[PDB]
Amino acid sequence: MEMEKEFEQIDKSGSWAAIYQDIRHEASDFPCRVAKLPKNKNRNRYRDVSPFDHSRIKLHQEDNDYINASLIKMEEAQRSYILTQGPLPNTCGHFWEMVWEQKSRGVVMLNRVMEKGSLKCAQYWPQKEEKEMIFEDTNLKLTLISEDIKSYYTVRQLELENLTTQETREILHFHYTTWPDFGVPESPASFLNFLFKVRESGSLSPEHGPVVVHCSAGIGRSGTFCLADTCLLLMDKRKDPSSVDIKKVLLEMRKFRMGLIQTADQLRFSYLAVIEGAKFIMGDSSVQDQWKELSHEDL
Ligand SMILES: COC(=O)c1c(O)cccc1OCCCCCNC(=O)[C@H](Cc1ccc([C@@H]2CC(=O)NS2(=O)=O)c(Cl)c1)NS(=O)(=O)c1ccccc1
Numbered sequence: 001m002e003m004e005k006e007f008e009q010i011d012k013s014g015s016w017a018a019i020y021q022d023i024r025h026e027a028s029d030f031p032c033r034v035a036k037l038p039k040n041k042n043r044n045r046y047r048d049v050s051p052f053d054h055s056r057i058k059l060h061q062e063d064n065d066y067i068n069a070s071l072i073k074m075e076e077a078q079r080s081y082i083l084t085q086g087p088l089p090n091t092c093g094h095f096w097e098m099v100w101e102q103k104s105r106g107v108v109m110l111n112r113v114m115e116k117g118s119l120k121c122a123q124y125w126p127q128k129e130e131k132e133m134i135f136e137d138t139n140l141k142l143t144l145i146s147e148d149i150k151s152y153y154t155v156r157q158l159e160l161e162n163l164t165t166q167e168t169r170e171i172l173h174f175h176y177t178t179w180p181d182f183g184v185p186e187s188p189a190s191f192l193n194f195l196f197k198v199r200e201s202g203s204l205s206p207e208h209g210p211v212v213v214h215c216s217a218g219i220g221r222s223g224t225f226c227l228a229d230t231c232l233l234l235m236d237k238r239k240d241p242s243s244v245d246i247k248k249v250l251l252e253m254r255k256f257r258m259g260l261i262q263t264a265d266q267l268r269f270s271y272l273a274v275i276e277g278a279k280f281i282m283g284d285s286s287v288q289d290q291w292k293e294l295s296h297e298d299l
């Protein structure tokens with residue numbers, strides 16, 4: 001596998017840092033004028049993490065259509081993802097408004113509301129069935145219907161309702177609770193077990209709008225998740241799966257949102273996730289159960 005041969009030589013050379021910084025040096029840069037307007041300062045969690053104007057998600061409101069979110073459209077892979085920062089106390093309504101308007105079916109969360117004593121994202125969904133949420137400024141109601149808590153991730157069924165029309169939709173929430181900030185998953189097994197749970201739910205079907213992926217900034221962990229998923233998509237689609245260049249796929253993704261993949265080890269982890277995942281794509285009908293055992297989700 002050319003992919004694992006390259007992985008092999010990078011490990012031997014000890015050159016992950018240089019490979020990573022090369023991608024950073026070659027990354028696209030586009031303007032983020034809207035995100036930088038004075039009236040949008042309180043809508044961004046980090047001053048140095050903004051969506052490019054050309055790919056930003058526009059809320060349908062006439063007041064202010066701004067939300068720190070980007071549409072990453074991977075053309076050859078044929079999959080679209082919406083990457084956004086962890087909502088802020090004042091942008092939780094906007095966040096659900098975007099989920100509603102874009103017709104998303106699933107939300108992938110890769111961070112925790114509090115990590116190492118610091119708030120990283122607002123509690124934008126109800127933790128208790130009997131305590132539903134109302135986003136006044138948005139005309140939306142959100143209710144927790146049930147949740148399946150595993151050892152390192154949790155899947156939740158939420159009901160989002162447009163109070164105006166009374167239409168309701170089921171939204172699936174895939175929450176990875178043990179992915180350290182600026183770090184990597186415990187193992188490729190645990191990552192892939194989770195990813196294939198999102199795939200198998202139908203949430204990523206082209207019949208729905210783009211799945212919404214976020215972590216705290218929407219670029220480190222979210223970038224890793226999307227990079228691995230897109231490469232696997234491409235390996236299953238090409239006549240020569242060994243042709244997938246992860247570095248080129250990341251650069252293509254970075255055209256839609258800045259800073260995807262935040263450390264050289266998150267890039268190395270992506271190689272491992274893709275290499276391990278290729279086995280299922282190429283046949284292995286036992287790898288999935290192996291990933292399950294290895295990830296000890298029923299701990
Ligand atoms: C590494 O940098 C890049 O890849 C990159 C690029 O190439 C082009 C454009 C942007 C880029 O990143 C932006 C972040 C660069 C890293 C430094 N930035 C940050 O930590 C933060 C932004 C930030 C970035 C990443 C994360 C998290 C890292 C992760 O694994 N997942 S995540 O929730 O996206 C979080 Cl929770 C926060 N901003 S700051 O506190 O106001 C701050 C400003 C200046 C110096 C220090 C801190």
Ligand SMILES: [Mg+2]
Binds near residue numbers: 128129
């Ligand atoms: Mg209860």
